[PDB]
């Protein structure tokens, strides 16, 4: 009574957006190691049971369209949805290869009123990206 | 009725306002730790248990190495935002 129902045909869809190379006009450098991340996440989320697809060096419009379309698919036979964002970023905002786009705009497509077939089902967002420029100096 | 914002979970690599660290030869700290925990326990722990162990692993196992001393030996804690209404197991 206290768990999400998992008795569906599919675990669900998992979208990995792996942004390594950025346009000169953005000024952002290459994210070395992010391919190692994406392949490790691919194996893990596949092992969990997600139908995983990786999309590389996406533009802001492609990220928005990828997530808008996924939101419009039929998830009746899916238990949940996951999306993983690997990119440069700043607070509330993530880099496409051609600029910044707000994270809330990527996720709002999955709101209860905009995606009925995921209603009452977990929608999960894993976000590797900066949220500002403060350093945690740590303490012993 | 049911809130339109319910049943989201955001697993951020870092806290609001802060850097997120990445090793060029091994990958980002958060993802290294997340994959570690998922290989061992993805199927028998609840999502908040998995992500709490990830928090601990990023907080303890990683320390930045850098030429610039402004960025020498810095630390990171990830940040989980849960609007979940039930426990979540992947099985």
């Amino acid at each position: 009574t206290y768990q999400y129902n998992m008795n569906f045909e599919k675990l669900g869809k998992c979208i990995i957006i792996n942004n390594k190379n950025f346009d000169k006009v953005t000024g952002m450098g290459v994210r070395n190691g992010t391919d190692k991340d994406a392949e490790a996440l691919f194996k893990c989320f596949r092992s969990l049971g997600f139908d995983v697809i990786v999309y590389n060096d996406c533009s802001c419009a492609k990220m928005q369209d990828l997530l808008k379309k996924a939101s419009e698919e039929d998830h009746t036979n899916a238990a949940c949805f996951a999306c993983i964002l690997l990119s440069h970023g700043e607070e509330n905002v993530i880099y496409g290869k051609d600029g910044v786009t707000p994270i809330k705009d990527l996720t709002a497509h999955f709101r209860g009123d905009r995606c009925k077939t995921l209603l009452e089902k977990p929608k999960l967002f894993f976000i590797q990206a900066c949220r500002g420029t403060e350093l945690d100096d740590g303490i012993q | 009725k049911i809130p339109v914002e319910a049943d989201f979970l955001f697993a951020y690599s870092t806290v609001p306002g802060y850097y997120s660290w990445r090793s060029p030869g091994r990958g980002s700290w958060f993802v290294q730790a997340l994959c570690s925990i998922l290989e061992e326990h993805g199927k028998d722990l609840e999502i908040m248990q998995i992500l709490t162990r990830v928090n601990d692993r990023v907080a303890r196992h990683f320390e930045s190495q850098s030429d610039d001393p402004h960025f020498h030996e810095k630390k990171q804690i990830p940040c989980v935002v849960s609007m979940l209404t039930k426990e979540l197991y992947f099985s």
């Binding site: 994210r31 440069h88 970023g89 | 690599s13 997120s20 060029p24």
Partner: peptide, 5 residues
């Protein structure tokens, strides 16, 4: 040599 995002 670590980097940030």
């Amino acid at each position: 040599x670590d980097f940030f995002x």
